[PDB]
Amino acid sequence: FQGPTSFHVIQTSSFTNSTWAQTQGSGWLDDLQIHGWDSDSGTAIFLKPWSKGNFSDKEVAELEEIFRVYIFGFAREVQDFAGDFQMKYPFEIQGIAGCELHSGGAIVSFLRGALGGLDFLSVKNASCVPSPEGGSRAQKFCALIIQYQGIMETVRILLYETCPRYLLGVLNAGKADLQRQVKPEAWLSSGPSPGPGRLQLVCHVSGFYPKPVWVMWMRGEQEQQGTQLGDILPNANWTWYLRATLDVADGEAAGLSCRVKHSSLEGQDIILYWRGSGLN
């Protein structure tokens, strides 16, 4: 099956000073957002009609309550401990937790945490593991967190028991959108490059879904190894944009084409041909 294979929740907690912290949160299938967290209400925003997966409204409400209580308590506890942990304001903490479906069917769960944009801790087989970047501070944290009744048990249940069934239910519930096929459009452009009698050719590919795509500059059947891929950039409404560039001598641009292969094309690749002397 195509489309996303993982669910995760993220947290960004921004600590301005000893009395002011604000948290932002959201839920994702790979890079596609499916939940928002509404700080006005302390509840989740369901971005797609199928965002609750196969969960009952009662269980969803229980999870939103767990998250609400966690977000509040976390900010409070970190403010109390900030002195004990030699913490200078302002600082930002990030967290991500979730699970992913692998080939063969295994579902693997993960939890990571960061401080100052660097890894701080992770959860490995139900245990708090300090990251080396977190140094002694992360070691003190791991020893502290496990003292809190229930916390690690709730994390264990959520990561290894709740998340896998949630993931499967939501990948099924959302399949008409998650596994849809949307065809890209493609176009060529050119520009100058630094070298003498050097040109840069650009093959633009936009509006495709799912994310996997193949784009190559070609000469007949020969793939040009010099093809440079840009970063895949998002569009609104769950499609992507990608540029594939080629640097070529002026007199050798004739004969080049761009070939695009995508799951949506039904084996009918897009082929654009570069023509010289300003003939598009």
Partner 1 sequence: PKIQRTPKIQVYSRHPAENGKSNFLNCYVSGFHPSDIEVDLLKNGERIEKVEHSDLSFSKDWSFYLLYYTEFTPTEKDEYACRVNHVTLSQPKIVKWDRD
Ligand X SMILES: CCCCCCCCCCCCCCCCCCCCCCCCOC(=O)CCCCCCCCCCCCCCCCC
Ligand Y SMILES: *[C@@H]1O[C@H](CO[C@@H]2O[C@@H](C)[C@@H](O)[C@@H](O)[C@@H]2O)[C@@H](O[C@@H]2O[C@H](CO)[C@@H](O[C@@H]3O[C@H](CO[C@H]4O[C@H](CO)[C@@H](O)[C@H](O)[C@@H]4O)[C@@H](O)[C@H](O[C@H]4O[C@H](CO)[C@@H](O)[C@H](O)[C@@H]4O)[C@@H]3O)[C@H](O)[C@H]2NC(C)=O)[C@H](O[C@@H]2O[C@@H](C)[C@@H](O)[C@@H](O)[C@@H]2O)[C@H]1NC(C)=O
Ligand Z SMILES: *[C@@H]1O[C@H](CO[C@@H]2O[C@@H](C)[C@@H](O)[C@@H](O)[C@@H]2O)[C@@H](O[C@@H]2O[C@H](CO)[C@@H](O)[C@H](O)[C@H]2NC(C)=O)[C@H](O)[C@H]1NC(C)=O
Q: Which is nearer to partner 1, 14 or 79 (CB)?
A: 14
Cβ 142 vs Cβ 130: under 8 Å: yes
Residues 37-66 that bind ligand X (CB under 6 A): 37, 44, 60, 63-64
Q: Among 245, 213, 209, which Cα is nearest to 229's?
A: 245
Positive/negative CA dihedral, 123, 92, 232, 266: positive
Site string for ligand Y, 39-78 (x = CB under 6 A): ---------------xx---x-------------------
Cβ 215 vs Cβ 271: under 8 Å: no
CA distance linking residue 113 with residue 10, whole number of Å: 10
Which partner from the list ligand Z, ligand Y, partner 1, none does 169 bind, CB cut-off 5 to 8 Å by kind? ligand Y
96 in contact with ligand X (CB under 6 A):
yes
Q: Which is nearer to partner 1, 58 or 88 (CB)?
A: 88
Q: Which is nearer to ligand X, 158 or 256 (CB)?
A: 158
88 in contact with ligand Z (CB under 6 A):
no
271 in contact with partner 1 (CB under 8 A):
no
Q: Which is nearer to ligand Y, 103 or 280 (CB)?
A: 103
Residues 33-92 that bind Na ion (CB under 5 A): 42
Site string for ligand X, 6-25 (x = CB under 6 A): ---x-x-------------x
Q: Among 126, 129, 188, 132, which Cα is nearest to 157's?
A: 126
Residues 6+ apart with CB under 8 A from 240: 206, 207, 208, 209, 211, 213, 232, 233, 234
Q: Which is nearer to ligand Y, 52 or 262 (CB)?
A: 52
Kindly state the number of chain residues that form the binding site for ligand Y, as judged by CB under 6 A. Answer: 8
User: Site for ligand Y (CB under 6 A): which residue of 168, 202, 253, 265?
Assistant: 168
Q: What torsion, rounded to 10 degrees, do the Cα atoms 95, 10, 44, 69 define?
A: -10
Please provide residue 214's backbone torsions phi and psi, each rounded to the nearest 5 degrees: -130, 125
Least separation, in Å, of the C-beta of 3 and partner 1? 18
Residues 6+ apart with CB under 8 A from 140: 84, 85
Least separation, in Å, of the C-beta of 55 and ligand A1CDL? 6
Which partner from the list ligand X, partner 1, Cl ion, none does 144 bind, CB cut-off 5 to 8 Å by kind? ligand X
Least separation, in Å, of the C-beta of 214 and partner 1? 20
Residue nearest to ligand Y (CB): 165
Least separation, in Å, of the C-beta of 258 and Na ion? 52
Residues 172-231 that bind partner 1 (CB under 8 A): 185, 187, 189, 191, 202, 204, 206-207, 231
Which partner from the list ligand Y, Na ion, ligand X, none does 201 bind, CB cut-off 5 to 8 Å by kind? none
